[PDB]
């Protein structure tokens, strides 16, 4: 992600959204999210609260 | 139904046809008539005031 900030923010608003499966009680990695999408500001800013 | 062309699936069933049953709930109330009141109602003895 070491790119220019406009392609970085396009990576944020397009690519940097994980998906997590929403019917189990453990956070399984969703594969090919076609019903939901988990966008992360805390991957763009690289911190935690 | 709204529709999209993505990998997430759409349903084909349109105009679901359901039947509904009625529940019964009757209501009663009595009212009483004395035989003196009935006999003075019907058989007029035409006598006086």
């Amino acid at each position: 992600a070491n790119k220019t900030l406009f392609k970085t923010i396009d990576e944020y608003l397009l690519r940097a959204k994980d998906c997590i499966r929403g019917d189990t009680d453990t956070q399984y990695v969703c594969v090919e999210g076609t019903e939901q999408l988990i966008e992360n500001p805390c991957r763009l800013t690289q911190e935690a609260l | 139904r709204v529709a999209s062309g993505a990998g997430l699936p759409t349903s084909r069933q349109t105009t679901i046809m359901v039947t509904k049953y009625s529940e019964k709930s009757p209501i009663t109330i009595p009212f009483e008539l004395s035989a003196a009141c009935l006999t003075y109602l019907r058989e007029t003895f035409e006598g006086t005031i």
Side-chain angles (χ1 to χ4, degrees):
Chain A
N2 178 23
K3 291 193 174 189
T4 83
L5 87 164
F6 290 143
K7 196 180 274 177
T8 298
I9 211 63
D10 199 286
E11 171 262 344
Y12 160 73
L13 69 97
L14 181 71
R15 200 269 304 162
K17 316 192 245 190
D18 196 2
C19 66
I20 298 298
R21 185 171 167 177
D23 60 2
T24 81
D25 295 339
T26 68
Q27 284 180 348
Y28 286 143
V29 165
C30 151
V31 49
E32 182 146 25
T34 65
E35 289 85 6
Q36 67 265 359
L37 216 59
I38 306 309
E39 66 154 4
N40 290 55
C42 287
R43 189 200 319 250
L44 167 72
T45 198
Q46 286 288 300
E47 325 288 340
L49 301 104
Chain B
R1 323 154 301 154
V2 298
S4 177
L8 273 162
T10 186
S11 77
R12 328 170 76 251
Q13 44 106 34
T14 290
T15 303
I16 170 67
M17 180 177 177
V18 78
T19 77
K20 283 281 283 158
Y21 293 100
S22 159
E23 62 177 1
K24 316 300 198 74
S25 187
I27 49 173
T28 66
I29 182 69
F31 72 101
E32 289 163 23
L33 298 178
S34 302
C37 202
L38 214 66
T39 45
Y40 273 97
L41 168 82
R42 311 158 76 256
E43 299 111 342
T44 49
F45 310 135
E46 62 90 28
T48 43
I49 299 310

